[PDB]
Amino acid sequence: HMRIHVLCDDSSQNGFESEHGFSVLVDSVLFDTGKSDVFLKNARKLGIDLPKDVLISHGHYDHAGGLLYLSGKRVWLRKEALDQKYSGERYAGADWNEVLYYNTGKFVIERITEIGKNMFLLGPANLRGKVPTGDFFVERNGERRKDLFEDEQTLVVRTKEGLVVITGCSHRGIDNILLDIAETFNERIKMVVGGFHLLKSSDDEIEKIVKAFNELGVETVVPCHCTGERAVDIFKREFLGKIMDCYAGLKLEVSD
């Protein structure tokens, strides 16, 4: 069997700490690392040793921040995760100078990158005419542009039961993300876990997304982090499959 552990999230079960950020241990690879050391403290609570490989979904502080608490990891990030991210006038980037001092960067350039057996990183999703919601900017060279999240990447784990998809915030659209996966893998999408960033999306926008989950035959959804209570309620009432509650304690077990 293959195990998954939420090590950081906005919610938590008794005993586990929580912050605004996301981190989930997926078998032999760590997906994101929260804002601070909450992921580590939760991991110690479970008596887990973290693996060599840490994957970064995008270069926001709440996803890349706990890297400040690791050394010697192999950090899989997109080159464009290095650009300094703003959210409004608020700096929201990560300290890559420090992170890459203590750790080792593995830069992801391809659309599809194989990590280990049956594990893949998929690059920035095709926006299909949509553009990220929110007030996000990015600065390359002191040049302030709008942020399209060219740094965003998504983990796909190929299971005998179908695909397991792990996403950090889905700025490019969780629907775009799934469709990109759908065009690449002949396999069915079994489970999707992570943040979908639906707090600033309209109920219509969210229903269209749930519709895509249904259309693609997704069986189980575990919405974390950015997703939002409203959006989850819509998932619970319109998604044809099972929705699970996400929290820092959470452990999921799934077939190889």
Ligand SMILES: [Zn+2]
């Ligand atoms: Zn983000």
